[PDB]
Paper text:
One of the simplest and best characterized TEs is the bacterial insertion sequence (IS) [name] from [name], a member of the IS200/IS605 family. It exhibits an unusual transposition mechanism using single-stranded DNA (ssDNA) intermediates and integrates specifically at 4 nt target sequences in the genome. Transposon excision and integration is catalyzed by the [name]-encoded [name] TnpA, which belongs to the HUH (histidine–hydrophobic–histidine) endonuclease superfamily and uses a single catalytic tyrosine to cleave DNA. Previous crystallographic and biochemical studies of [name] have shown that TnpA binds specifically to sub-terminal imperfect palindrome (IP) structures formed on the top strand of the left (LE) and right (RE) IS ends (named IPL and IPR, respectively).
In this work, we determined the crystal structure of [name] TnpA in complex with a 29-mer LE (LE29) and a 6-mer target oligo (T6’) at 2.6 Å resolution. LE29 includes a 3 nt extension at the 3′ base of IPL (positions +42 to +44) and T6’ represents uncleaved target DNA with a cytosine base at position +1 downstream of the cleavage site. In the fourth T6’ molecule, C+1 points towards the A+18 base in LE29 and it is stabilized by π-stacking interactions with Y7 (chain B) and F112 (chain A). In this case, C+1 occupies the position that was occupied by the catalytic Y127 in the previously described TnpA/LE26/T6 structure, and helix αD (carrying Y127, chain B) has moved closer to the active site where it is stabilized by hydrophobic contacts and hydrogen bonds involving Q132 and K125 in αD with Q59, E37 and E57 in the protein core, respectively.
Author numbering:
A (entry chain A): 6 to 132
B (entry chain B): 6 to 133
DNA sequence: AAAGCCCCTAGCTTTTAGCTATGGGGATA
DNA sequence: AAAGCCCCTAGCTTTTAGCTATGGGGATA
DNA sequence: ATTACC
DNA sequence: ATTACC
């Protein structure tokens, strides 16, 4: 199952994890549900397919298929950036002793249908 | 085993495949060896780790770890663009029998340690 | 120590903001 | 038909080149 | 204003 | 000028 843009046929799926500033346990309750809505809205607007997404109290997991030419960091900057603006506009406690909602950092890991040990079998390495 | 730049901790591995123009079986002999020489130079110069690379006459496989902020496309653009420029200077048959060495297209497939269905179940069951 | 904390610039969105950049500099303990 | 074929612009490298762009048009017939 | 998700 | 890469 592969998508394509004008020039690239691709399957670029990323496991994305980022945490709030100071790793606060704020991704619960109304903030959690509203965070998921904003990300879903960003993905739709940016042509990103959210395969799975779930918060875990002080961090969020996202499994997203992103156009490799568009860039994974552009989706991440947009997701974290807009969600920070809106959630801090809608939830005052997200500005209390919080200079920002997110950190400058995140975790990214590529994911495919086949694991890495299987895909290396596709290729006879000539190094 | 994860890497990190200034802000991102990542493991971004891509199975990349692209073919010569018209799918001509030109990736043999000295063209094959010289092509892999140039991509090694591009990888080292662009901080890209080449896990595995194989040419097979009419296509090249590359399994590579690429900085996600740098972008998989900037590596592909440089690897294809520079190899096309150099090999067409050094092999007359590549400059006279083809308008370009490569096509405008490629294949990109991400890969990690776990299968997709396992990561999917793992993310879905986070809240218990 | 760093990804995560503090500090800085510049770029681009979310712009009397708040995230990136294969971005930089630190102490704390 | 499209990723792959022919055409284009525009950005950046490899620059009396040749690749990208979440880029566009099209015929094959 | 932090302390760790893979 | 192509026809498909575990
Ligand atoms: Ca096209
Ligand atoms: Ca978790
Ligand atoms: Ca192998
Ligand atoms: Ca093979
Ligand atoms: Ca830094
Ligand atoms: Ca640590
Ligand atoms: Ca086809």
């Amino acid at each position: 199952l592969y998508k394509s843009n004008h020039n690239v046929v691709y399957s670029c799926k990323y496991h994305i994890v980022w945490c709030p500033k100071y790793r606060r346990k704020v991704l619960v309750g109304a903030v959690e549900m509203r965070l998921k809505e904003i990300i879903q809205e960003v993905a739709k607007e940016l042509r990103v397919e959210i395969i799975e997404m779930q918060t875990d109290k002080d961090h969020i997991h996202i499994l997203a298929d992103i156009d490799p030419s568009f860039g994974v960091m552009k989706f991440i900057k947009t997701a974290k950036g807009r969600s920070s603006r809106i959630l801090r506009q809608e939830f005052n406690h997200l500005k209390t002793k919080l200079p920002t909602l997110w950190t400058n950092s995140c975790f990214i890991s590529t994911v495919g249908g086949a694991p890495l040990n299987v895909v290396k079998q596709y290729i006879e390495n000539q190094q």
